[PDB]
Symmetry: none
Subunit: 63 residues, 4 copies
């Protein structure tokens, strides 16, 4: 029953690639914004640490 599989099946290769491409695009955009900030010397070390900790919290990366 193909129709049941359409509702039930885990993410397809194309769907998984789409989700990961959104992560990649956000990472590129963050590098662009941070690259400009760092060039204008706008991020102190505590500010860098807070950005890094925010991202680790998003990732549920417990380090």
């Amino acid at each position: 029953g193909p129709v049941v599989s359409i509702i039930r099946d885990d993410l397809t290769p194309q769907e998984r690639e789409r989700l990961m491409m959104r992560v990649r695009a956000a990472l590129v955009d963050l590098g662009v914004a941070v690259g400009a900030s760092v060039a204008f010397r706008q991020l102190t070390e505590p500010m860098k640490s807070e950005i890094a900790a925010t991202v680790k919290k998003y990732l549920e990366y417990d380090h």
Copy 2:
């Protein structure tokens, strides 16, 4: 000499806020993309570590 100051002076409060708002916007977008990925269980621990390391490299955050 106001005209000279317009070329020479360091970033104004408004310019600094604009640069930092772009960082914030990219951080929100990354949280949105990562939030969706983590919900679909798409990020393994090594993939999380690589994303975190990429951001630290952008930040020139040597930890």
Copy 3:
């Protein structure tokens, strides 16, 4: 013959798959949006219940 069947016949496998793919695509998009919301801690328990009840109402799922 054939021309009458083209108007009268029930949905073909291809047409049924197209309809169910649109349901799947909307479910993925809802998981993406909800995944981001839940990551930013934006949905309280009553809000979750209201979203679930909305979907059950769409489905005509009387539970």
Copy 4:
């Protein structure tokens, strides 16, 4: 002052509204797709239950 707050502060009203609008838009799209499916009598009771359970799982709604 301000620049630190731009990195640190919790989501603003505008940002919260944008996140919730994406949930609303996905819910409308799911109602559109399900509305078409139900009209063509394409969802059995078990299929409805599976869609509802998928959404509750997204929501982390433990009912």
